[PDB]
Each structure stands twice: as structure tokens, then as C-alpha cells.
Design a protein around this nucleic acid. Structure first.
Ligand SMILES: [Mg+2]
Ligand SMILES: [Mg+2]
Ligand SMILES: [Mg+2]
Ligand SMILES: [Mg+2]
Ligand SMILES: [Mg+2]
Ligand SMILES: [Mg+2]
Ligand SMILES: [Mg+2]
Ligand SMILES: [Mg+2]
Ligand SMILES: [Mg+2]
Ligand SMILES: [Mg+2]
Ligand SMILES: [Mg+2]
Ligand SMILES: [Mg+2]
Ligand SMILES: [Mg+2]
Ligand SMILES: [Mg+2]
Ligand SMILES: [Mg+2]
Ligand SMILES: [Mg+2]
Ligand SMILES: [Mg+2]
Ligand SMILES: [Mg+2]
Ligand SMILES: [Mg+2]
Ligand SMILES: [Mg+2]
Ligand SMILES: [Mg+2]
Ligand SMILES: [Mg+2]
Ligand SMILES: [Mg+2]
Ligand SMILES: [Zn+2]
Lengths: 155, 86, 123, 60
RNA sequence: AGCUCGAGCAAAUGACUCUUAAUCAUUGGG
RNA sequence: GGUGUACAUAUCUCCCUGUCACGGAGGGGU
RNA sequence: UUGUCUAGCGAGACUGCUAAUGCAAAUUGGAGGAAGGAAGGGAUGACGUCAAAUCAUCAUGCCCCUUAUGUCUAGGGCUGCAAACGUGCUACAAUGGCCAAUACAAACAGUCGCCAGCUUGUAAAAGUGAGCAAAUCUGUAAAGUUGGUCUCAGUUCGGAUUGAGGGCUGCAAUUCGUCCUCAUGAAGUCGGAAUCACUAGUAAUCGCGAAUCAGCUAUGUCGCGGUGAAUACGUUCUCG
RNA sequence: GGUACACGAAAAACCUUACCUAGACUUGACAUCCUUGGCAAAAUUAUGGAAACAUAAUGGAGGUUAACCGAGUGACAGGU
RNA sequence: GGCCGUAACUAUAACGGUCCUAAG
């Protein structure tokens, strides 16, 4: 009942590593509209990644996001009682957006010290397929695999 | 709160009445409406009838009540017990 | 520590350990520190008897923390024994100042005692 | 009671802080524009009638 | 108490509504 | 326990609805 | 730092040109263009519904009072308080607390006013005292940047409440003003069932100004700028 | 209810204020019409006073009564 | 087989709650 598809604004390439995902995750960890503070958090986390992993921070970040990045989504559809879920293949853009959102949400909840180290350690843990965003992706994947039967009927 | 250079405050009609009744031996209650007047040292020993809004409540000032406002020792609204709505 | 009956934390700085005393706040603690010349940013555990006696002396010069509670109690009893409206308001456990008591001011009335409001069967 | 209050407002009081501004056309006490000495509900009428020079509707 | 055992109904006064009912309070009445 | 034997019912508060009932969350009473 | 800026007039954008398909309106894409297909925002709101709201802005039919339901004044009240709901502010914190230095706005307002500078004071402010009837003078911009410190605790969070000393306005600050200083340090560690707002300079967030005003816990209202996001696959469901 | 609840109220200490208690007034605090004169109203200083209001003072701008200051006077004014 | 409450004069309870039994 809208019959119009929304436009899309430019993502902008990052001006340090020339990787758009860096700008995307900056905007995701944005709070109170503080671009400077978000950029400081990201670059400090990347420097801590340099100090710890002894590898390229952009490569480590890509290895983390690609591993956290899900495949199936379960859409809620109620008919009579409760909701029976529906597995659908997601577009690549929404796939990346969900990966970044999960990364930030599970990074801002860990027990550690300053958010710099928080997000840095979350990224290094997700780089090895052992983390909280990993658990989230596993849970949604297993739920979709369980409710594979109703995949044919969507709406 | 009240400024220093300004000092205290009395309506001075109460002050004249207090001076007269202090010079007079057989003092009686002084019926006053001026709740804004502060209790001056010369007030000590007298009894006032302050207008609470309806009646004149009698307050006996002491060497201790010196400083506060005259109507501060009398109330204006009374509440003692609610009633159950249901 | 050594300041009267109060044991300030050993792993905290001096200008906050002084705040830990009842009669000493933060600004007054800084005032004592500056008057005694003892430099802040010095942990209390890494402090010596020479400063520990001077700080105690200046605190004794100031109003004792122990006598402050009885001073406040005496002042409230004084305000109540006059028959003041302020004393009466303080007596019945209600906001002393011109604070509203219609729908707020629970910090002086404690937990809410919910009652049954009026039954509305429409009119 | 409105005529007595209007007349008392015109009459000077014995204290400076006793004085308040009422509308000059009507007698409304609250919401009076000191720039025009006219309450809001009479200012609207005068502006719609063109009485106040330069007071046009605003579009921003 | 007018009725059933100070209570609840009955009656009246107001609030309530275009006006009532219902409701809300108050209330005399041994 | 107010009623049948701590439980249920019942009572109170908040959601829900145009409103009420139903329904949901919380509290108290031997 | 020479062409900003301010405000009059005017040009510019008209589906004007092009390709597709349509009978035609027209729809979509491209070019040039600051701007493209209601370019963004505002004013502008049909007949009528709800016997919707206002006799307390004003006016008015009718009824009612006429040494009183009319008038003046002092005091009290509209600020009560076992409770319940709505709308907001402040928080529960290291995207942070405190301290120091410091950069960048727009709009508006001002002669019982805006108040620069200086002296006094821990401070609210006081005294002196220029400037400005104002693109001239005044109304400290804050978030932001750097540095120091705290090191995850009911704390250097949080400020409620409470006692004392002062400032200003005002005849007058007790009922019932607000500000400063000192002292105390409730709850609260992300909030149940259930709900609200928002489609770009928007939400979020940080300050500034004005109206009524002697003064005001307006945290309210109307405006201005700084930083500045995420998402829209689709109408199966939900309200209209 | 949506379309009430930081709404009327863009400022309740006095005034505002329409409420209560109390002290005072009666063609009235305000206005017109009429028979009638203007040689005042203010403001402030005294005493009584909670202040209204009373008794005495400077008796006043002005323009001969223009506006207003009055007497008489019944229609009436007045009502948030 | 019991107990309790319940209809706008009174009265009663069409109706509701609950305990037990193999079923009342
Ligand atoms: Mg207040
Ligand atoms: Mg509550
Ligand atoms: Mg009128
Ligand atoms: Mg005023
Ligand atoms: Mg009616
Ligand atoms: Mg149009
Ligand atoms: Mg109606
Ligand atoms: Mg309405
Ligand atoms: Mg009328
Ligand atoms: Mg009064
Ligand atoms: Mg009010
Ligand atoms: Mg810091
Ligand atoms: Mg200049
Ligand atoms: Mg300055
Ligand atoms: Mg910094
Ligand atoms: Mg706690
Ligand atoms: Mg703090
Ligand atoms: Mg006060
Ligand atoms: Mg904590
Ligand atoms: Mg829209
Ligand atoms: Mg009043
Ligand atoms: Mg003359
Ligand atoms: Mg003549
Ligand atoms: Zn008006």
C-alpha cells in the first residue's frame, strides 16, 4: 500500500583503509551524533588489533564480518495461534547490515574495560568463529533449519 | 534569605502597639493580622492573636521564638484524616 | 586509618578520603588540604605521620563530624519545641519546604501504600 | 465583576507592584501583549481588520 | 428508625446529564 | 482469610477496549 | 585576506530538448543544468458530522439578585494529601565524572533596559562606571580538540531530601519566590503486561534568543543555529 | 476517548481573583438622561486605624465651564 | 451428596463459585 521503493544514499568509502564497511560500522556505533568519538573508537580498536594479532586490521575485520554474516532470515507470520516462521534468502546489503548491527550490539555488552578494548576483543573473537554474534548467527540458522518445512509458503 | 542591609521587618504599627503594651503593666492579647512581621526582642513576654485566616490564634512569644515570622507559629489549613474512596 | 573513629580507605586519594568523613565534604576537604599545604594526588597509604597529625589538627579546628549529628538533632528538637509550622511539618514526615505533596514527594513518605480509588460506574 | 476591575486597573494603586496590565479594548487580564496593549483575541481581530499597520500574516 | 437485622434497603437533598435511570456523596429519621 | 477446602474464588492497582465483560502483569489478606 | 554580506528589482526550471510507448493526457530513462518532473518548507482547510468546545475574551435572547449574587479593603486560599493517571526534566555512568587550556554559529532583544572594563567577595552579586536608541555598544556559546586524573564501586555516578550562612526583586519571601556557598547524601545498576514519535539536515543530541514578567525549580511555549544517523524487502497481518 | 490532562493560564506571595473569614458602602467603584451651580478632583502631611474609611491641613492642572467637580433626581448602573 | 453468593417493594433463586464420590 505504498507501491514505491525507497531510494538509497551513498555509503561513502572510508578515507583511511578505503573500505566502505569501516564507515558503515562507524555509523552503527554512532551515538548522540558524535562522528569524532565513533571514529576514535574504531581507530583505537584497529590499533589494538595491530598490537595483538600482528596482522592487517582490515583483513581481520573482513574475516570477522564474513564469518558473522548470516545466510537465512526467519520472518514472523501469525495466522491463528503463535507465529510460524519462514526462511528467506536475504540480500547482500541487508546481510552486511545485520552482521554489523549484531557485532556492535554484542560488543557493547561484554564485561571488559573501555569500549575501545570491548569492540576490539569482540572483533578478534569473531575472527575465529567463537563469539556472541557467532552464537546469534548459529541460533537463527538452527531455527531456520528446524523450520525448513514452511519455507515454501511465505505470503 | 532576606538581605542584610535591609535587616528585619515589622509593620511598625505592631511595633508601636508592642512598645505601648510593654510600657503598660496590665498587658492583654494583641490582635494582629500582620503575619509578615518578625518577632523583635521587645516582643518577648507579650501574647498575640494572629489571624490564621478564619480566627485569631493566641501565641505566647518567648525569649526563644525571637527571629522567626509572627504568623509562622499559627497554621492556615487543617488536614487530619482521609476517607476510603471505595 | 588514623582520623578519629573513621577508617578512610587506604587505596583512595587523600582529598576523597577526607570526604569520607561525615563532617567533611569535597570542597571543605580541598580547603583543609590547601591550608595544610599537603599535596593532593597522594594516596593515603603512602602518607606519613607528619601530615596525619596536621590534618587531624585542622579537622579538630573545624566542626567535629561527631558533634554535627547531635547539632542537627538539637536544632530539629528546638524547632519542634517552639510549635512552629515548619516544626510541625517536619514532625508529620512531610516535605518541610514549599514542595508540592499532591502527586509527588515520596522521598520523605517512603514506599507507596496503594489504596482503592473511587469506583466509576459512569454518570 | 469586570467593570469595577477595569476601573480599578485604570486607577493608580498605593503600591508599585500592585499594578497589572489589562487589555484596553476588552478587559481580559491574562495574555496581554505589552507591545500593543491588546490581548490575543482582540489582536487577532484587529490584525484581520487591518487596524494594526504592518502586521501581516507570516509565512517564514 | 418506614422495612430486613449502628449496618443494609426505603425517603430526601445536592453532584451527574438535554432530562431521567443508574451512580456518587451527604443526610434527617429510635 | 470475605466464601468453599497453603489452594481456588473473591478484593485492590496497572494494561486491553469507545465502555464493560473476558483476557494479561503485580500486590495483599488466616 | 576585497568581493563576502545585507535588501530592492530581475534572470533561471518550462516535461523546455531527446529515446521508448500511447489516440491523448501522460509514465520512465538520458543530456545540459545550482536545481527535474508538486526542487524542500510555510500560509492556504469545500458541503457537513460530533445539539463537539467556549455565556469565564467579546456581544447577546430569556430567567434570576437589586442596602446584595452589586462595591472597597486586610488576612487566608487557588501551592492541601493515604492514593491513581498524563506530559516533561534528571539519572542509573568510562561513547563517562571532575579540572585546565581552547576553536567554530544563526536568529533575536535592548534606555525603569542591554550592561563592556575595573575594585571587592569562596559565589550568587555589590560599588564605580564608560558604550549603545543600535549591521557600530551589550547579551561569556555548548557539544567538539588536546592534556591531567579517576579504573567499573551504589563509586570522584546520581542528585533528591534535610540543617546553616548569605544575594536580588519587592510595602512584604511563614503559609508561598528563586539564586549562591557550606554540610547530609533517598531511590535508581536499563525498568513487567503493554505502548509513542520519526523517511535528511529528519530522528538523536548541544547550546542561544524572545513573548507574558518587579521577581519566579517554565525542566513549559514560540523560534535559531552546531554535530548529525539507521531503515523502507513488501501489503500476509494491524488502526484509520 | 481519538478531538481533555506543561489545556484556557504568553507568569496565582499582595494585585491578578472570579473563592472563604472579617471590617466597611448604597442611583453606588463606572455611565447616560433630565432642573441646577461651579471659586475641583488628585497627590501628600497629621490622629484614629489590619487596611478599607473617617475627622484637619497645602486647597490647588485649568478655564468660568470646556473635559471634569459637583447638589437634586427617578428611570437605573452593576453581576466572571 | 453438601456448602456459599445472587433478580429494581418484599420473598425465592433462573444463574455463578467450590469440596468429595464410581456416579449424586
Ligand atoms: Mg514550589
Ligand atoms: Mg508510580
Ligand atoms: Mg462584562
Ligand atoms: Mg504582576
Ligand atoms: Mg447542566
Ligand atoms: Mg492550494
Ligand atoms: Mg453539549
Ligand atoms: Mg474538545
Ligand atoms: Mg451574563
Ligand atoms: Mg485580598
Ligand atoms: Mg492551578
Ligand atoms: Mg576523560
Ligand atoms: Mg566594529
Ligand atoms: Mg566578562
Ligand atoms: Mg577530551
Ligand atoms: Mg541501590
Ligand atoms: Mg556527581
Ligand atoms: Mg520562603
Ligand atoms: Mg554500577
Ligand atoms: Mg512523509
Ligand atoms: Mg489573591
Ligand atoms: Mg479654582
Ligand atoms: Mg458658571
Ligand atoms: Zn482584548
Amino acid at each position: 500500500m505504498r507501491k514505491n521503493r525507497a531510494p538509497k544514499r551513498t555509503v561513502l568509502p572510508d578515507p583511511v583503509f578505503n573500505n566502505t564497511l569501516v564507515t558503515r560500522i562507524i555509523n552503527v556505533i554512532m551515538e548522540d551524533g558524535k562522528k569524532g568519538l565513533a571514529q576514535r573508537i574504531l581507530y583505537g580498536a584497529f590499533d589494538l588489533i595491530e598490537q595483538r594479532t600482528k596482522e592487517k586490521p582490515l583483513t581481520v575485520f573482513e574475516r570477522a564480518v564474513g564469518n558473522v554474516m548470516p545466510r537465512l532470515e526467519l520472518r514472523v507470520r501469525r495466522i491463528a495461534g503463535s507465529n510460524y516462521q519462514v526462511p528467506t534468502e536475504v540480500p547482500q546489503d541487508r546481510k552486511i547490515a545485520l552482521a554489523l548491527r549484531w557485532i556492535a550490539m554484542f560488543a557493547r555488552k561484554r564485561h571488559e574495560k573501555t569500549m575501545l578494548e570491548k569492540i576490539a576483543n569482540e572483533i578478534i573473537d569473531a575472527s575465529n568463529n567463537t563469539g556472541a554474534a557467532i552464537k546469534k548467527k548459529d541460533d537463527t540458522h538452527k531455527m531456520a533449519e528446524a523450520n525448513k518445512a514452511f519455507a515454501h509458503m511465505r505470503w | 534569605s532576606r538581605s542584610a542591609k535591609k535587616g528585619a521587618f515589622v509593620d511598625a504599627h505592631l511595633l508601636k502597639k508592642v512598645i505601648d503594651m510593654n510600657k503598660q503593666e496590665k498587658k492583654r492579647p494583641i490582635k494582629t493580622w500582620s503575619r509578615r512581621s518578625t518577632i523583635f526582642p521587645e516582643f518577648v513576654g507579650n501574647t498575640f492573636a494572629v489571624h490564621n485566616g478564619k480566627t485569631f490564634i493566641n501565641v505566647y512569644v518567648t525569649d526563644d521564638m525571637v527571629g522567626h515570622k509572627l504568623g509562622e507559629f499559627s497554621p492556615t489549613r487543617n488536614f487530619k484524616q482521609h476517607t476510603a474512596n471505595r | 586509618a588514623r582520623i578519629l573513629g573513621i577508617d578512610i580507605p587506604n587505596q583512595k586519594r587523600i582529598e576523597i578520603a577526607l570526604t569520607y568523613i561525615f563532617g567533611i565534604g569535597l570542597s571543605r576537604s580541598q580547603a583543609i588540604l590547601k591550608q595544610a599545604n599537603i599535596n593532593p594526588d597522594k594516596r593515603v597509604k603512602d602518607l606519613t605521620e607528619e601530615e596525619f597529625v596536621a590534618i587531624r589538627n585542622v579537622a579538630s579546628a573545624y566542626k567535629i563530624e561527631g558533634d554535627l549529628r547531635r547539632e542537627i538533632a538539637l536544632n530539629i528538637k528546638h524547632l519542634s519545641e517552639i510549635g512552629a509550622w515548619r516544626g510541625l511539618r517536619h514532625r508529620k514526615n512531610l516535605p518541610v519546604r514549599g514542595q508540592r505533596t499532591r502527586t509527588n514527594a515520596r522521598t520523605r513518605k517512603g514506599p507507596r501504600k496503594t489504596v482503592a480509588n473511587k469506583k466509576i460506574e459512569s454518570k | 465583576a469586570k467593570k469595577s476591575l477595569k476601573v480599578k486597573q485604570t486607577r493608580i494603586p498605593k503600591f508599585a507592584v500592585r499594578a497589572y496590565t489589562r487589555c484596553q479594548r476588552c478587559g481580559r487580564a491574562r495574555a496581554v501583549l505589552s507591545h500593543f496593549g491588546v490581548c490575543r483575541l482582540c489582536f487577532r481581530e484587529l490584525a484581520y481588520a487591518g487596524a494594526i499597520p504592518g502586521v501581516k500574516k507570516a509565512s517564514w
